[PDB]
């Protein structure tokens, strides 16, 4: 949980900050920043290149691939929401906030993040002045097929994406129990998702629709 994957996250955060600061992301630069290289950044970077997280450009700068950038962004979002939490609510001494949040970034789930944006006064910037990125990405709430569990719960519909369906029979089925963009009950079992809407009615979705309809926690 934090001694391999989090090394990767630390490296990605460092590259992100260097770009943010207007500094060319060079390996030596990353090395002093993290007080590493002995077990050089070189071996770690080569590993990230294999995983498709970054590419070493012609000069020597590190360019994050789109997937790497998406991961780097989530890490910065978690760190900065942690800083905001540690400062506004916990009240930890500002001189200790940076280091604590650097550890916390590796353990905060997306769900905790969603609650923090709801509980914090302002999530615009961190206490250190930098903007908190990826708030949008947080919330396409999620593919129904994944967000569903054997344990029922309410959620809100962000998109049905009927445009992408081939199996039309369920459109009217949904329309009857309403289900357009409102709370509903989600549940799994024999891998078949059912749904209850504002009108106590059930609709057993077919794979196609279950993979496509996207909800959003509330």
């Amino acid at each position: 949980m934090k001694d391999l994957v989090d090394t990767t996250e630390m490296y990605l955060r460092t590259i992100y900050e260097l770009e943010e600061e207007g500094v060319t992301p060079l390996r030596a630069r990353i090395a002093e920043r993290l007080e590493q290289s002995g077990p050089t950044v070189s071996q770690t970077v080569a590993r990230m290149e294999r995983d498709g997280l970054v590419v070493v450009a012609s000069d020597r700068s590190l360019q994050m691939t789109p997937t790497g950038r998406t991961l780097a962004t989530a890490v910065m979002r978690k760190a900065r929401l942690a800083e905001r939490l540690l400062t506004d609510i916990i009240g930890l001494d500002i001189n200790k906030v940076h280091d604590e949040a650097c550890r916390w970034e590796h353990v905060m789930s997306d769900e905790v993040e969603r609650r923090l944006v709801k509980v914090l006064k302002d999530v615009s910037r961190s206490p250190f002045g930098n903007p908190i990125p990826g708030l949008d990405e947080l919330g396409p709430g999620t593919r129904v097929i994944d967000a569903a569990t054997s344990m029922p719960r309410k959620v809100r519909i962000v998109q049905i994406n009927e445009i992408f369906q081939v199996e039309t029979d369920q459109f009217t089925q949904l329309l009857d129990a309403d289900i357009r963009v409102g709370s509903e009950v989600e549940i799994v079992d024999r891998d078949g998702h059912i749904t209850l809407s504002h009108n106590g009615k059930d609709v057993e979705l077919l794979d196609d629709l279950a993979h496509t309809i996207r909800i959003e926690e509330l």
Side-chain angles (χ1 to χ4, degrees), residues 3 20 48 54 59 67 71 94 103 163-164 192-193 198 218:
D3 214 64
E20 191 170 60
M48 289 170 68
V54 303
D59 43 10
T67 68
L71 181 48
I94 188 64
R103 248 151 38 211
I163 191 145
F164 296 138
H193 300 181
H198 301 182
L218 54 66

Side-chain angles (χ1 to χ4, degrees), residues 170-179 181-183 185:
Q170 300 184 0
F171 291 159
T172 297
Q173 207 168 63
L174 280 49
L175 235 48
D176 289 334
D178 181 287
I179 308 180
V181 178
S183 300
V185 180

Side-chain angles (χ1 to χ4, degrees), residues 9-23 25 30 33 64 68-77 80 130-134:
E9 305 186 322
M10 279 194 285
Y11 276 61
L12 285 172
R13 158 172 180 163
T14 302
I15 297 174
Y16 188 104
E17 301 178 324
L18 292 181
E19 297 192 326
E20 191 170 60
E21 291 160 42
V23 176
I30 288 167
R33 189 89 156 207
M64 287 189 289
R69 164 169 291 96
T70 295
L71 181 48
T73 301
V75 177
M76 299 308 297
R77 189 185 61 225
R80 289 179 176 164
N130 286 315
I132 299 183

Side-chain angles (χ1 to χ4, degrees), residues 99-117:
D99 287 1
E100 189 86 24
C102 156
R103 248 151 38 211
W104 288 38
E105 77 189 22
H106 301 308
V107 173
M108 299 177 41
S109 67
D110 303 332
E111 191 46 45
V112 167
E113 284 190 281
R114 287 190 274 278
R115 297 316 321 297
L116 290 169
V117 172

Side-chain angles (χ1 to χ4, degrees), residues 7-153 155 157-179 181-183 185 188-200 202-215:
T7 297
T8 291
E9 305 186 322
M10 279 194 285
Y11 276 61
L12 285 172
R13 158 172 180 163
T14 302
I15 297 174
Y16 188 104
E17 301 178 324
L18 292 181
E19 297 192 326
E20 191 170 60
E21 291 160 42
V23 176
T24 295
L26 301 169
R27 285 172 293 179
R29 205 59 195 257
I30 288 167
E32 64 168 349
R33 189 89 156 207
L34 292 175
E35 280 173 51
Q36 297 282 285
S37 199
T40 300
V41 173
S42 187
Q43 262 181 287
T44 298
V45 171
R47 213 115 41 187
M48 289 170 68
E49 188 159 42
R50 298 262 184 172
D51 299 330
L53 305 175
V54 303
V55 165
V56 188
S58 298
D59 43 10
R60 179 241 206 168
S61 66
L62 303 186
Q63 289 177 47
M64 287 189 289
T65 63
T67 68
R69 164 169 291 96
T70 295
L71 181 48
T73 301
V75 177
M76 299 308 297
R77 189 185 61 225
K78 290 175 190 298
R80 289 179 176 164
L81 287 178
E83 301 178 325
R84 205 70 257 174
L85 171 63
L86 289 164
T87 294
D88 305 346
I89 296 182
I90 306 316
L92 180 64
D93 163 43
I94 188 64
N95 291 292
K96 299 167 172 302
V97 178
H98 166 277
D99 287 1
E100 189 86 24
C102 156
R103 248 151 38 211
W104 288 38
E105 77 189 22
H106 301 308
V107 173
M108 299 177 41
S109 67
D110 303 332
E111 191 46 45
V112 167
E113 284 190 281
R114 287 190 274 278
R115 297 316 321 297
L116 290 169
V117 172
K118 175 182 176 177
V119 178
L120 296 176
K121 139 274 187 78
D122 176 280
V123 288
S124 301
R125 301 177 186 298
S126 70
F128 305 109
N130 286 315
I132 299 183
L135 295 170
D136 36 285
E137 165 68 59
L138 203 54
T142 287
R143 312 296 281 291
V144 169
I145 189 177
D146 297 313
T149 299
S150 53
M151 190 171 274
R153 60 163 185 166
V155 206
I157 289 180
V158 178
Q159 63 187 10
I160 297 176
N161 293 299
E162 44 275 299
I163 191 145
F164 296 138
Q165 299 312 300
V166 173
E167 204 72 348
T168 299
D169 286 301
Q170 300 184 0
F171 291 159
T172 297
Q173 207 168 63
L174 280 49
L175 235 48
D176 289 334
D178 181 287
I179 308 180
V181 178
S183 300
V185 180
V188 193
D189 52 301
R190 292 307 160 189
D191 298 308
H193 300 181
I194 317 169
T195 304
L196 287 163
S197 179
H198 301 182
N199 338 305
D202 287 293
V203 185
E204 210 173 311
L205 308 177
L206 290 181
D207 303 308
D208 342 303
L209 225 67
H211 268 263
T212 279
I213 293 182
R214 288 186 185 172
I215 59 181

